[PDB]
């Protein structure tokens, strides 16, 4: 809908200007599930929009049958690759073996693993054969994110964490971590908050962070103390930022409540970054907002990884996949423009 | 949206009419709270309850004059220390809590507090229900209720909110009390939620929520799965399922496409949460971001009608709460017919 | 002198029990046969008709030290050397049968039965003796260990040390002052019950308080534990006054009790104080002993199937006679209930 | 036994004259307690302190005339909410606990409690000390003191009792506050008790109590041994020994006969306990069946002089306690000019 | 050697079982239809009429590698590719039914069933084959998992790996050497029973030792666990000699047993060794294999409803043959239990 | 096989010849044991040590002269209670354990027990070594040794066995002492074993054993990987690898085929076990079913040479044990010239 339509549009244009400012180059983005119906319709929409050069994984023949089966003339010159047959396959196996030979994985096992398109996608982005990847529209979340974590890994002091946008009529809220960590520590919560914060900063918005709890500034043993400590750590790391907690969710989003009941709070003007204390709360919240709050909700997107990779959920729509790939492109460009410095 | 409240108001009238026209006596510890009083104006125009206010009679009349609402004069006003049943109440609280760290002086001082006094009023039949906690935090407001009124058999104190959608309403629990309920506690919460939904002539369809879809893995997935099983064994006629993600629960299309083995068909109308972080955070986020109205929380599992507001409540929230307290009070009066 | 009046009544009951049982005196074996102090005690008691003592050690060594402190009334006393007693191998055989699956081999067992403590124990267990008194030479844990291993507890019983505080008219009973680090609610109830039976033996109504640092709070930890212990004790003997959790001054002082906690079922001051942990019991009884004017006797071991007592390593000679007296009484009481 | 009390009283007079004849202001939240007023009768006639009574002015004047006590007709009596610094006091408390669950309404209503008000008065220098808790249980009374006045640096709040023997005096700690103190905490307590004993020109000799004589075994014995080692390393001039049984500690003859290696000769005069059950049971049993008079408990480790009585306290117990509260207030004021 | 005799006996007993069952051979499926070692094994196995092998993979790849390794006797052998088989979707539906509440949806079930291990498993489960051998190609946990998810355990049974140590005279059986990290007393008892029932099949008296670092100590930890395990085992099978806790030399050397522990119900030396945890069983069998002169066969999977074994990938061709032999033998046993 | 043992004997002869003809003094607490006396019979004709027997002098001559031997009347015999340095020994033991539950009488009684006496003989330089425990179980026998002689700096008591093959020898540890050694502790055991292996002129190659090959998974895999890393960081000159299975550790062909990245080439000759079950069961199983002779256990990590047998030992085992005990005694005596 409407708010979603303007948001994505600004993003599509920035990928246009970032490609137009690096010689017109498009980010190379690999899709392990080359035969997915949903993914292919999405790519159809995506290629006329000049955002990425897609790379598809699977048997060349089987996917060409399925794209023709799905009536799409705009998608025939795109690279299609079967991992075992790619020329860089064995260097990739040796690399994975090198990475996990002391983590229960032997050489044969590395070969078997690298044959799975997820691992191959990850190794492609990791070795620079692709700029980014989108995976997991058919497999469950944990299993899809695992190769990304083993192969691409996190940036220094970073923590893998899923992030969603709920798009309101002027502003947007960001929610994390919605997919990865069961029960993040105070330290992990602070880090999750900082990652969410940089994402908000990309969009030119001042980040205002709340560490969520079932309590309003109580600091009692358990989740309240944990979110209070998390805000204290985040603040020690970024003294320029409005970061506050522990607080209830309405206290966080509604500044009128804040200023009336807790005026001492350093969080003024309503939070636009919401950090959850555990996975039950984040997962349940973003999904409920999506289904009954009737507010537009995009994501989840993966934060904390060194190269751009995002895993879809199985319930994702086709335009949802387009959103995900757009942001994968933006992230890839962001990273490559940051590695030039 | 407005339809639901107005309907309930009609039911208060229909029940009161079927009982000789008396309205449920509802006590308010916060007698000088602005919100409680003007909301009370709006509800008192509607013949929903006979309000009893606690405080100094004179401070309450001064602040009644201050908010220019003549329509609630002549309503009963009581100062706890000066009520004739005061010493008897103190004696009661004492016998209840003398082996729980409380001496007679402590009992006296506690019964002077409007919350304890209200609680005891409801417990002794001096009132039918109470609405408190627009000024103090939930734990502190709910505590005298748990100590005085208590739970019914095998019951569990649990907060429940309604999400009122376009045709449907969803019920959410436990949104206020239990930090990390067990499987067993979750089943009980489900059962309580279910009875509430049944009151409204709707068949309960229950979801035990998790971050997972039917995995049964160690931790929350297994706990909510086991909860579903326990609920089914205590009441086999019910549509109760889990572990499942929230969208899987509320969206029948997702259910039908991705998990057709599920004994839950048609979208859930009861969502039981795995812990207080998720339940509290969710209902408050929905109330603030979704168009849908959220009423509550209402305290389930207690022997008499008692409800704690959230401190962040608007006045419409308070009139809504008082309405559903009234209904609850007459439902209870009707279950006490046995 | 409360100690002398108190012991004197006891001595009269051992005398009363010995009559009507053919005039027979309980046989009590003493593992430290070469100890100066034990012998000093035996001198005083053979003059008092309380038991027929059996001493363990080498006959030559024992007559040596009996000759050294000039005591003629204990010549003609039963003296036994463990390896040379005739039932020795039958004994080693039973200990072996008892502990073959609890780390003990036949040789190890052999050497253990050679230890005076284990043999004294096995003697009482096989009915070749009626009671024992041990550990005037060895440490407490180390002395009680063979007793628990050979003699054991009676049904539902729990090993527990008990002291008497003798005041100007009544006495207080304190337990458990020696054995259990951190008794559960259940165990505290059993401790209470055993103490109570002792008090009942003296014709006094037992009045039991489960001690805590709290007055009826039932809060998490020891308060809830002692409240629950009293509820258990009350369920097991509903005729008895048993109450808790409460503070010690609340416990012993009835005026304090009635002024502050009239709902309490304990009226008249406690005469049995059951403690929540070993620190409280041990420290209390020893302090009462050292700064309190009042005399404190014990500790005596309760809960065992046959009459056994462990002394302290620091114990005096009168400590040994009152200990042996109580041991005789215990042996007689048991033999008389085993009568139908 | 009363000899010790007289020595203390005379010192109160001596310090009082060395500061212009000025008396320590000590506030008593229980302004209407018969016990406190009778004890204050004895104290004002003894020139030990300037009393501050908390409550409604007229009700306590009513009860001082009602209980026939003419020597405190003119004493300062204060009702908290009507005090001129009431709102600034609410602001400091609010500021202190806004992130520990307390909102401004809760701050106001708390500051109304005489306990909280006594503590804030001493905190802000409006009074020099306070004695409370003859009517409420210990935890509830000591809490505002810990929240408002707090501990001094590296300090640990702990109750200390004096055993007055016919000869020496013994000190017992921690007799009221901490359930199961660690080695480090036991050491700290030993040092605080030690400084108290030094105040009286006495060499403190410290014993860490246990059920064991120098075993150091897993549990309480190791803890009391390690606590003695810690104490010895933190203050090498003091005789501090453990683990040991109590009779070993107080009887020097047993010490020389059985453990001549101990660095403690001459019998202990500072007894530090392994847990709250042992300290509480012990001092109370000694007080009730022991022939020695026991005073306290006194709270150590706090920045300003504040002491909580025991509920079982006698009136002579209160006069004793307040005498030593005065001495403490003076020591604290004389060290604060540095 | 010892291996050659034992294997010949197993083979002759497979032949003896094929009689009275119509000359029918156990149907055994090999998901790794293209494994060199397995095909090499299958030559030897089919000349010996041990099983009717079913190969999984592409018909053309497997016939190509059959031709490439010159084995003429495996042309016409059943070869099935999971995806093109007629009961494929029915198999997917069954797996979906088994794991829909354990995190697997219909699509995940489809993909899993596409894997030869899962398809093999489901064949055994559905009676379209009698047994399976996998994992000469993948590491152990991954290979054993589909078997447990599809085939499962029998009543009160436990997945457990078992090895034979073949000596110059006797054989010892070792378990559990592959699956369970730290089995309980109860689980150890079950493991012992499974090892025993196997020993019984060969007409041998099972004599079982619960191994520990201790001799009949029953102390906290693994000693108490192995003694308790032995007690549970005895209570379920009183005709059997089962003893513990004991040290290994005590267990296998009857002269030691009789000299130091005559009370022990284990006389004549153990031939079943049940280990307290996976470190000890796994390290034990590998050290025996590598430094003793003793031959070691296995591991074999016990506790499963139908006949399935996983090789280790480090397996030799003769190893695959042993595995298939004992798998066939097991299959026949199980079919003999379905005879009432 | 026999060659390794004869080589040890040949070296004890070489040091015994090269330091003036001195034979290492070795004490035996069980002076009346048949097994020990038969071993002593084989050993005294081999000039490896000066034996001292413990028990009643006349009783040990009763059983030794009586059963098959003419070469044992020339031997040292000691009854603890009658030895001239007895009371001095109890005095040092008292000093060592006075704060560990043992008082002077208990010190006397322990020192009358031959095990404590033997250890104290070695500790005071009055003897060079001891061999004990064919009559008592292992723990009870090793305790006086640990309480008296103790560990060297950063050392940890650990039993070590040799498996003797036709070319190599392997060491297995810790086979006797620690239930579930930590990563740090395992590294330490590795280091002590490596030191013994260097002594025999072989380069140590250490493998940390697991049920897994380089998985590093939660539990034992991670523990042994971590142990190998710590050990390498303390001794970078050593080949140390893990976590790995036993065939992977001992068989170098397996290593190069399956795990070519490993820093361990040539097969491990030092095997460190993850727990007491695996170590004890392993060495006993190899001992009973493999052709190979297994000697030990020998107690490592302790300051002076002391060793405990298991009863399951044969006489030839006692022969071997006393042999490396004498040799050990000579090595430690050579560190004592510094």
Numbering used by the authors:
A (entry chain D): 436 to 776
B (entry chain C), D (entry chain J), F (entry chain L): 439 to 776
C (entry chain I), E (entry chain K): 437 to 776
Pull verbatim passages from the article behind this deposition.
Bacterial hybrid malic enzymes (MaeB grouping, multidomain) catalyse the transformation of malate to pyruvate, and are a major contributor to cellular reducing power and carbon flux. Distinct from other malic enzyme subtypes, the hybrid enzymes are regulated by acetyl-CoA, a molecular indicator of the metabolic state of the cell. The larger ME isoforms (hybrid enzymes) are predicted to be a fusion of two unrelated enzymes; a catalytic N-terminal ME subunit and a C-terminal phosphotransacetylase (PTA) domain. The PTA domain is homologous to PTA enzymes (that interconvert acetyl-CoA and phosphate to CoA and acetyl phosphate), yet they appear to lack critical catalytic residues and thus acts as a sensor instead.
To verify these findings without using mutation, we were inspired by flavoprotein methods used to remove tightly-bound FMN32, and used a moderate Br−/urea wash step to generate ligand-free MaeB. Washed samples of the native MaeBPTA PTA-only construct (hereafter referred to as PTAapo) were crystallised and diffracted to 2.72 Å resolution. PTAapo retains the same D3 symmetry as the acetyl CoA bound form, and, in agreement with our HPLC data, there was a clear lack of ligand electron density. Loss of ligand binding results in locally small changes; however, the use of d2 as a stator and d1 as a flexor means that these small alterations are magnified at the isologous d1:d1 interface. When superimposing the two states via d2, it is apparent that acetyl-CoA attracts the 3′ loop, pulling d1 and d2 closer together.
